[PDB]
Design a binder for this molecule. Structure first.
Ligand code: CA
Ligand code: CA
Ligand code: CA
Ligand code: CA
Ligand code: CA
Ligand code: CA
Lengths: 212, 212
């Protein structure tokens, strides 16, 4: 009647409800026992995410879960005999929702603005782009972002004028050739990709003005 | 002394080892107990994926797991007094590895080949591409594949000569205008992505020959 922590992944597909664990009281030998659960996700909102079979004691989940909505449920199980007397003290059940990589990284803006002096030596820091990821950055790689440049417009004097640091999102002058007179602004297409650059991804824009 | 099933996600990061569950014998009261585990993942290959502190009974996992290598471990715990008599019947512990989308889909071939009659009416089935995904297709969407066409070469008489059913991978003639004399073959770059098209992806080629 001890109960260990319980885990469920989010976004489970398939037939519902699904078994989590069978609750049991020792007093089952001396009398007939009925089981119940209380708390948010049980008898309070969100009602009915978790249910328990009153006779067998099977705790179940009734629907897919979403770790970015609710990462943890605290429930309580109850054990009542047919005479109407509690035969256990209500027992705490902790349900942890585990993560799936179901969120694309997301830039903090959709157009970032920076500027750079045409005279800047190659390897001069220009500006910083940034993305966030709603997935579990503490236990997984589902939120580990890597920045990349996708395209540059215009592609002149050539098409690698700038570079981005994949960890920090800092954009730097890659090569010399910046000519305000001949092209006054560059528009980069930047990409954030999770799983260390290898996962889901999104894009945004960075607009670079060449100063005097 | 009964152990509910245990879950652990694959590819966990952070410090190791990590607590799973505290095992304990009741006779803990009468005498001092030492705790042990056996099985594949404990004392047999893979040795040491799971360990247990012998006095506290804390069962731990020592490294990241990989569902696609081993999805399920069966271990036994043991409880021996300091007098050297077993104080519990060995307990089966089932550890379930839950999946992460950490496998790109994989085309069954690098280059698929097909043919079509230039007279073929738009909507004519041509050929089929196929891919598999090593992730968990029973419980998750991490292996749910959608097929798209990425590019066509040549892009003549225009670029959407064909189309692909996103569920079946059946490529079909989309428009009229096939002309063997001018454009004898098409090279299609096809893509398979999981999370129903929204996820990890790979590409392969489909070369279509235009027949009389
Ligand atoms: Ca979610
Ligand atoms: Ca998630
Ligand atoms: Ca993510
Ligand atoms: Ca794996
Ligand atoms: Ca996997
Ligand atoms: Ca996959």
């Amino acid at each position: 009647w001890v109960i260990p922590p319980i885990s469920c992944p989010e976004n489970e597909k398939g037939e519902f409800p699904k078994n989590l664990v069978q609750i049991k009281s020792n007093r089952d030998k001396e009398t007939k026992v009925f089981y119940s659960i209380t708390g948010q996700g049980a008898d309070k909102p969100p009602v009915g995410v978790f249910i328990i079979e009153r006779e067998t004691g099977w705790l179940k989940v009734t629907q897919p879960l979403d770790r970015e909505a609710i990462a943890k449920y605290i429930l309580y199980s109850h054990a009542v005999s047919s005479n109407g007397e509690a035969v256990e003290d209500p027992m705490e059940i902790v349900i942890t929702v585990t993560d799936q990589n179901d969120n694309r990284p997301e830039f903090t803006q959709e157009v970032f603005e920076g500027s750079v002096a045409e005279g800047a030596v190659p390897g001069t820091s220009v500006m910083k782009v940034s993305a966030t990821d709603a997935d579990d950055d503490v236990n997984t790689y589902n939120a580990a972002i890597a920045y990349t440049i996708v395209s540059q417009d215009p592609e002149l004097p050539h098409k690698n004028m700038f570079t981005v640091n994949r960890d920090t999102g800092v954009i730097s002058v890659l090569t010399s050739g910046l000519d305000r007179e001949s092209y006054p602004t560059y528009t980069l297409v930047v990409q954030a990709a999770d799983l260390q650059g290898e996962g889901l991804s999104t894009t945004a824009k960075a607009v670079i003005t060449v100063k005097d």
